[PDB]
Amino acid sequence: NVNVKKLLESLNSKSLGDMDKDSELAATLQKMINPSGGDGNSSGCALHACMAMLGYGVREAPVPNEISEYMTGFFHRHLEQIDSEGIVSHPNETYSKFRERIAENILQNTSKGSVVMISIEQATHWIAGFNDGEKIMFLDVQTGKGFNLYDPVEKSPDAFVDENSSVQVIHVSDQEFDHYANSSSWKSKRLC
């Protein structure tokens, strides 16, 4: 049974930059949460990443035919935030700087140990964010990457972000995460 505290300890002892940390954790979680390497709707992976980082457990994300159990209606209280402008890239902004700037917004509006669901360009793609107290870790546990904007190719930290790129930071409530935790659907998802 997967102990997330001990993954973080181990990881945070490494002389790796923050992006590489995120990338390592996410690749590790991807194998557990998305073993099938599915590439459809990423919201369930991102939610399962959130659940894992909050200490509820590491479970396999719903596959497409399990979406209708719970994920189908998950965001109903957040539809306006998901459609809003959110945080828009600046011209000539590198991936690393846009990341840092997203991170600062999240760190200012969230408390330590919290998580957020991050919509990329109005739900074009979902990633997760974990506030460890000093920094935000960005986790794409569907594809096994840290911060990305759902480009069809990998992007280095010094690549330029395309104009008008955006993310919407969705503050899913502690109630919403707990509700999921107490559902049949979560409980039938395979532990590990």
UniProtKB/TrEMBL annotation:
Keywords: Plasmid. InterPro entries: OspI-like, OspI-like_sf. It comes from the Bacteria. GO terms for biological process: symbiont-mediated suppression of host TRAF-mediated signal transduction. Disulfide bonds join S42-C45. Pfam families: Gln_amidase_like. Coiled coil: none annotated. This is ORF169b.
